[PDB]
A paper describes a structure:
Bacteriophage T5, a representative member of the T5-like family of siphophages, serves as an excellent model for studying the assembly, infection, cell wall perforation, and DNA ejection mechanisms of this phage family.
In comparison with the previous study of the T5 head, we built a more accurate atomic model of the pb8 monomer from residues 164–457 (out of 458 residues) based on our high-resolution density map. A structural comparison of our α-helical domain with the nuclear magnetic resonance (NMR) structure of pb10 in solution reveals that the α1 and α2 of the pb10 monomer undergo substantial conformational changes from the solution state to the assembled state.
Residue numbers in the entry:
A (entry chain K): 205 to 457
B (entry chain J): 164 to 204
C (entry chain b): 2 to 67
D (entry chain L): 307 to 408
E (entry chain L): 205 to 255
F (entry chain H), G (entry chain I): 358 to 408
The structure:
C-alpha cells in the first residue's frame, strides 16, 4: 500500500462582533483540520500458455512468437478494458465505472437507434459534471466510442468552415477538436444501447497506475509432461487521488 | 501475506508524506477591489 | 415563421430574396435575415441562400393542404 | 453486406450529395476511422452531382475550395476524390461509390 | 493458392488472482488461440492477335 | 435598407451597417439625383446610360 | 441586443460579442444621452440633427 495524506478541507473564520473585542472570543473559533489519508494498492494480472514439445515438431511453423504476443496483448486488452470498465470488485475500477458511482453518467439526448446522433455538444456538455475539476481545458482527455466518433463527423454542426474553421468536416473529414478538447477514439466503451456510454472526460492528473510488478515472462520447462510453460504475470491498478474527476456520457434511455 | 516469512502490518505500506489537496474553489471577489486605509473607527 | 400570414401577402410562390425582404408588408411577419435565420435555428455561419432556400422549402412544405 | 442503400435517387430527385458519400464510412467499421487509409472511387455522374451539391458550393460552406469559386470538388469530407467510369450504369440499385481500405 | 494464417482475436488476462498468492491460481487462466488460415488464388486472363 | 447590402459576410468592408453609404451597387458607381420624376406609380427611379 | 449587429459576419471586428460597445451604426457615430424624454409610449429615442 502507499498512503499519501490529503490536506483537510478549509475552515471558515468567525466574524467576531463588537461585543467581544476583549473577551477571549475576540479571537474567534478554532480552525481545526485533520490530515486525511489516501491509500493505494494493487491487483494481479496473469496468463498461461503451454507449448507441448511434440507440437512444435508436429507442425510446420514455430508457434512460439504467437504465445508471447497473445499473453502480452491479453494483459493490455484486459487492462485497457478493466481501466475502462472494471467491476472494482477484483479488477480495477474504471473510468466508466468510476463515473457511474460518482453519479456522473450524464444521460444525454444522444440516442441509441440513430435518431439523435451523438453531437459534439452532447459530448462537451458532459464537462459540467466534472465541476471545478473542469475549467482549465488543457488538463482533460476525451475518449469517445467509435460510433460517437463517426457521429461526431456527421455532425451538421462542425461542417461549414464558417461554422468551425478550415477544420470543417465538409472540407476535412476528421473531427479532431471538439470545443477545445482533443478527440481520441476508442472502441472499448460499452457497445451502443440505451444508456451505455459514449464518452468520458477524465481529469488526467488525478489518476495514477499503482504498479508493484511489471510484465515478466517465466518459462518453466515441465518435463514429465513435455510442455514448456510460459507464465507471464503482472500487477497494477487504476486509482484516483480524489473522488471527482471523470464524467461519462450515456445514450438516452 | 501468504508466504512463509510474513511481516506485521504497516510494514507493507510506504506512508508518503506528500500532502495532496484538491482543486479548491477559486477566490475572486476578495482581491479585486481597493482599500481605504482607514486609521480611525 | 408566420408562413400562414405571408400567404396573404404573396400567394403560392415566394418572390426572390430581394423583394421579400423589401416588401413593407412582409417586414412585420419576417424582418431581415436576422429573424429568418434565428427562426430556422440556422446561424450566421450558414450562408444566406442556405437560410433562404430553407425558408422557401418551409413555405412550400407548410402550404395549406389542398 | 456493405451495399448501404443511400437515399440518393436515380432520375434526379436528390443527387448523390456529398454527405451521402461519407456517411458510408460507418459501415466500414473500426477500419474506417483512420481516414488516411481509404480511397473513394465515384462514378462520373456522381462527380457531377457532387459539384451540384449545395454543400460544397460556398466559399463559406467550404473554404477557398468551394465549387463556385473553383469547380472541381477535389476533397469530400476528408477523403480524396478520384473519378472512374467503370461503375455500373446508373439505374436502380447500382453503385456510385466505394471506399476501400487499401 | 496462398494460405496465410490470421492471428485470432484477443485473449484477455485473468484480472483477479487476488488473495491466493503462491497458490497455483495466481498465474491465471490460459489465454489461448487458433490461427485461421485464409486462401488466395489467381484467375487467368488473356488476349490474342494475328499480324 | 436593402437587406442585401448590410453584412460584412455578404458584402465586404463596404457593408451598410458598418458604413452607411451604398457607394457601389454590383459594379456600378451610384450617384444620386433628385430630379427624377416624383415618386408615383410608374415614374422612374433609375437610368443607366452608356455615356 | 440588436440581432443585426451581433456576429462577425453581420459586422466586422467591431461586433458586439466580440467587443461590447456598438460604436458605429450604419455609418453614423453613436453618442448616448440620457436627456431624451422618458421612455414611454411615443417619446423619442434618437434625433439625427444637422449640425
Amino acid at each position: 500500500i502507499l498512503t499519501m495524506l490529503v490536506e483537510p478541507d478549509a475552515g471558515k473564520a468567525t466574524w467576531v462582533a463588537a461585543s467581544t473585542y476583549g473577551t477571549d472570543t475576540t479571537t474567534g473559533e478554532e480552525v481545526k483540520g485533520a490530515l486525511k489519508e489516501i491509500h493505494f494498492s494493487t491487483y494481479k494480472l496473469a496468463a498461461k500458455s503451454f507449448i507441448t514439445d511434440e507440437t512444435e515438431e508436429d507442425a510446420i511453423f514455430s508457434l512460439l512468437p504467437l504465445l508471447r504476443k497473445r499473453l502480452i496483448e491479453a494483459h493490455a486488452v484486459s487492462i485497457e478494458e478493466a481501466f475502462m470498465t472494471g467491476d472494482g470488485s477484483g479488477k480495477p475500477k474504471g473510468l466508466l465505472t468510476l463515473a457511474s458511482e460518482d453519479s456522473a453518467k450524464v444521460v444525454t439526448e444522444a440516442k441509441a437507434d440513430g435518431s439523435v446522433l451523438v453531437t459534439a455538444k452532447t459530448i462537451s456538455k458532459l464537462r459540467r459534471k466534472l465541476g471545478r475539476h473542469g475549467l482549465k481545458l488543457s488538463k482533460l482527455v476525451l475518449i469517445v466510442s467509435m460510433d460517437a466518433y463517426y457521429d461526431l463527423l456527421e455532425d451538421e454542426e462542425w461542417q461549414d468552415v464558417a461554422q468551425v474553421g478550415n477544420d470543417s468536416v465538409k472540407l476535412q473529414g476528421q473531427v479532431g477538436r471538439i470545443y477545445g478538447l482533443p478527440v481520441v477514439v476508442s472502441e472499448y466503451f460499452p457497445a451502443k444501447a440505451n444508456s451505455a456510454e459514449f464518452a468520458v472526460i477524465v481529469y488526467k492528473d488525478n489518476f495514477v497506475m499503482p504498479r508493484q510488478r511489471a510484465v515478466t515472462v517465466e518459462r518453466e520447462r515441465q518435463a514429465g509432461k513435455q510442455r514448456d510453460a510460459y507464465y507471464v504475470t503482472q500487477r497494477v491498478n487504476l486509482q484516483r487521488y480524489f473522488a471527482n474527476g471523470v464524467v461519462s456520457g450515456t445514450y438516452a434511455a | 501475506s501468504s508466504s512463509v516469512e510474513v511481516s506485521s502490518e504497516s510494514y507493507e505500506t510506504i506512508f508518503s508524506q506528500r500532502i495532496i489537496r484538491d482543486l479548491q474553489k477559486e477566490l475572486v471577489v476578495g482581491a479585486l477591489f481597493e482599500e481605504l486605509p482607514m486609521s480611525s473607527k | 415563421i408566420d408562413y400562414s400570414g405571408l400567404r396573404t401577402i404573396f400567394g403560392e410562390k415566394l418572390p426572390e430574396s430581394h423583394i421579400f425582404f423589401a416588401t413593407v408588408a412582409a417586414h412585420k411577419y419576417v424582418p431581415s435575415y436576422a429573424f429568418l435565420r434565428r427562426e430556422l435555428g440556422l446561424s450566421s455561419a450558414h450562408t444566406n441562400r442556405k437560410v433562404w432556400k430553407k425558408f422557401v422549402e418551409a413555405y412550400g412544405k407548410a402550404i395549406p393542404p389542398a
